């Protein structure tokens, strides 16, 4: 019967909550209260990337920490050389409604997708010398919100159909399907070892998935609204989420609960993007109030503010070597800060 | 590495020339978001004007129009609707023939969205003939509604049909006038699915939207 199924589910949730409460011996705040604060963080803009016609949704740094890719609603993927500000490639998209872009770790491929429900993989190392559609992955019944390369032949995508997918680029087939979310899966983050990944959806919950078996390992709750961003800690044992409730939260894989909440009284706008520094001490979050906030990830203190953008900050990413952080906003400009 | 940097400069110059051409093409094209229910008559309007998202291209008086359809998307329109915050207009099609209350709630959500502000809405009150050939129980206030003095009924129209259609139009316009503030405007039209004037109505509304935006830039309005 449905009623006994519901009561079994609620008693299981009560047992899980009791176990989490039992494991909550101490708070991270009262543990890091005795460490020195990071002080005022004064980042400045060094480069301003211009050329995009419309608002920008996604950017992704290359593993060389020099080249990056940006996706705009005019139908353009642009590869920027952040050192010299020059444009390397300009890829026109068949569908101008792009919401995500990814850079392959090898740098030979780029990915995009959006309202067309298609994950387009472009080859940047063609013999002829021009960028062409290497592959088109289809099968999602909802808009593509995020995509991340595992390697040159495997990709992971999050869609608005409440499911995630693991695709083999060579065969173009959806090798694995991750189901369980009850809302639009908005953000995706791969672990440093690329063995697990966290997905944040519009059901105010985050889920940890194993790549091999395609099953949900843990579910983390605590956010009051839709989760728009997610990012692993550099260690890989924890992650951070930003939600529409104007809060960021730090969840732990081993503790299976939330450790810290980053929010302020005067912040009433949702978070669109989050990222960690190289050491994980700083948490950078982009907000709807046109600004980015750098928080002390260990003390939940507002370390600094990045206030160079004129419109909504849609994305931000930190280089692999941690030299600089690039923010892309709806004002059609990218800004590199350090 | 002067030669390596020279290659980057020339490649950037080529890319910027292509981007200038693309910008010239892009600024001369008007993008419209077509919203409506499955039974509201949106599909037949699309057919007359001619999987994730559908495209229609049409030229009116040598002016290009780039119209989009929702396509294969879930009813959860909370997130992807933001992607159309910068379109020229949202053509919202409502079947006037309680789906009317659902359409009103959707229109209210679109109008009051923080990102859909500054975006104008062209209201197509479709299926006017079905309403004419077909309210008190679903809308009690209709008992105390009178036809506005500014109404311009088509000749040979039953006064009851005119009263009903203008009541629906005023019900939709109440939301628009509640929080208009002049940042965006609503354009209602009494249309039919097979009407050939819908294209002209959209073109005229786009002209008015562009003129009002230009006036706002000069603070004249």
């Amino acid at each position, epitope marked *: 019967e449905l009623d006994q199924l519901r009561q079994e589910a609620e008693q299981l949730k009560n047992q899980i909550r009791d176990a989490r409460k039992a494991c909550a011996d101490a708070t991270l705040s009262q543990i890091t209260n005795n460490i020195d604060p990071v002080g005022r963080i004064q980042m400045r803009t060094r480069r301003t990337l211009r050329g995009h016609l419309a608002k920008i949704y996604a950017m992704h740094w290359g593993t060389d920490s020099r080249l990056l890719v940006s996706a705009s609603q005019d139908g353009k993927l642009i590869i920027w050389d952040s050192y010299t500000t020059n444009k390397v490639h300009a890829i026109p998209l068949r569908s101008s409604w792009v919401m995500t872009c990814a850079y392959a770790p090898s740098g030979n491929y780029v990915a995009c997708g959006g309202l067309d429900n298609i994950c387009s993989i472009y080859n940047l190392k063609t013999r002829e010398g021009n960028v062409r559609v290497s592959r088109e992955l289809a099968g999602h019944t909802g808009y593509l919100s995020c995509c991340r390369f595992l390697d040159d032949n495997q990709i992971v995508t999050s869609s608005g159909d*409440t499911t995630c997918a693991l695709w083999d680029i060579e065969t173009g087939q959806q090798t694995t399907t991750f189901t369980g979310h009850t809302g639009d899966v908005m953000s995706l983050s791969l672990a440093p070892d690329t063995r697990l990944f966290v997905s944040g959806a519009c059901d105010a919950s985050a889920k940890l998935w194993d790549v091999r078996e395609g099953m949900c390992r843990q579910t983390f709750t605590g956010h009051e609204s839709d989760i728009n961003a997610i990012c692993f800690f550099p260690n890989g044992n924890a992650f951070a989420t930003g939600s529409d409730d104007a809060t960021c939260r730090l969840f732990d894989l081993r503790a299976d609960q939330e450790l810290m909440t980053y929010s302020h009284d005067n912040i009433i706008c949702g978070i669109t993007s989050v990222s960690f520094s190289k050491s994980g001490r700083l948490l950078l979050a982009g907000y709807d109030d046109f600004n980015c906030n750098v928080w002390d990830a260990l003390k939940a203190d507002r370390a600094g503010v990045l206030a160079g953008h004129d419109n909504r900050v849609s994305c931000l990413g930190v280089t692999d070597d941690g030299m600089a952080v690039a923010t892309g906003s709806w004002d059609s400009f990218l800004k590199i800060w350090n | 590495q002067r030669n390596e940097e020279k290659a980057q400069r020339e490649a950037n110059k080529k890319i910027e020339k292509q981007l200038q051409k693309d910008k010239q093409v892009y600024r001369a094209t008007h993008r419209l978001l077509l919203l409506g229910a499955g039974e509201s008559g949106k599909n037949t309007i699309v057919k007359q004007m001619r999987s994730g998202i559908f495209e229609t291209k049409f030229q009116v008086d040598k002016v290009n129009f780039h119209m989009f359809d929702v396509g294969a998307q879930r009813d959860e329109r909370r997130k992807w609707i933001q992607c159309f915050n910068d379109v020229t207009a949202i053509i919202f099609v409502v079947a006037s023939s309680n789906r009317l*209350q659902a359409a009103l709630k959707l229109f209210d959500s679109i109008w009051n969205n923080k990102w859909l502000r500054d975006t104008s809405v062209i209201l197509f009150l479709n299926k006017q003939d079905l309403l004419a050939e077909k309210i008190e129980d679903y809308f009690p206030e209709f008992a105390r509604y009178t036809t506005p003095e500014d109404a311009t009924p088509e000749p040979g129209e039953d006064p009851r049909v005119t009263r009903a259609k203008y009541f629906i139009r005023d019900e939709f316009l109440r939301i628009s006038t509640a929080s208009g503030d002049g940042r965006h405007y609503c354009y209602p039209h009494f249309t039919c699915s097979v009407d050939t004037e819908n294209i002209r109505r959209v073109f005229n509304d786009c002209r008015d939207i562009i003129q009002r935006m230009h006036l706002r830039q000069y603070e004249l309005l």
Partner: nanobody
Amino acid sequence: QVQLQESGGGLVQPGGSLRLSCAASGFTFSNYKMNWVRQAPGKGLEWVSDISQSGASISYTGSVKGRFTISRDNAKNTLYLQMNSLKPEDTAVYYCARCPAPFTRDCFDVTSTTYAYRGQGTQVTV
């Protein structure tokens, strides 16, 4: 996590009255605008009533206007729908829906199927 629990409802003679309640947990109740929706047998979800954050702005659908009243207690983190003089077509499963985001006038997808911020619903039958 977000948890909305609806209590009340059942069998009642036509023209009767009863008070549906809903208790909310896992979020700040005073920051969210609340809705009452219903699903009739063989029909889709239909919006019924709407109350703002402070309760100043209140709206109803035309079918139940003048018979249903909606209220909220922010201190008790709950809301109530008192229905008077019921009719045979009011038999439905009533759900309480929370607006997806706080400090927003718009409220998207409350009546859409598979909505995360909605309760399990309680049955009301004449």
